[PDB]
Design a protein around this ligand. Sequence first.
Ligand code: GDP
Length: 178
Amino acid sequence: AIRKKLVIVGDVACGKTCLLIVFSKDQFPAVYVPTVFENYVADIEVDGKQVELALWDTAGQEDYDRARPLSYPDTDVILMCFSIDSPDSLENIPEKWTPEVKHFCPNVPIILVGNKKDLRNDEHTARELAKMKQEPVKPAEGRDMANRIGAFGYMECSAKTKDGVREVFEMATRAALQ
Ligand SMILES: Nc1nc2c(ncn2[C@@H]2O[C@H](COP(=O)(O)OP(=O)(O)O)[C@@H](O)[C@H]2O)c(=O)[nH]1
């Protein structure tokens, strides 16, 4: 049995938990999905191989700088997230999450994930961000940040529409494998 530890990080409310929830619910046979993910085993199949993905969610620990890192030992792949409706969450990628992850998880592959891609085209999130003189993150910006931080790859998804969720985990699994 091949088991890979996956830790997901990113700012508060950037969609980390909902991303795990949508993925866990896509499993078959259908299982009951809890609200917390700490060493939560998800069985996935990518390229014909059965893989056990142990999920670790740092949601609720974004401000526990000394406690949060205890979850990093022996991580096989990192899902570093930001929200497309929040350029502030993207700016924290190089300023907070990358230095931390690279320190505690050296040479561990990182998948830069842009959550809430369904909000990019939302008129309400466009107005709220305009008040702060901001606008949704463009695909190009995400791809550039991925290159800058040396991520294995960049993926966009939406936990709400489920678009791109499957692909995020397939890429994370391949990275953990290779
Ligand atoms: N529109 C939209 N809202 C989302 C999406 N994913 C999460 N959210 C919402 O964002 C809020 C916080 O994200 P959540 O995943 O619950 O927690 P986090 O662990 O702090 O990222 C909640 O109100 C969610 O319903 C998404 O793909 N699209």
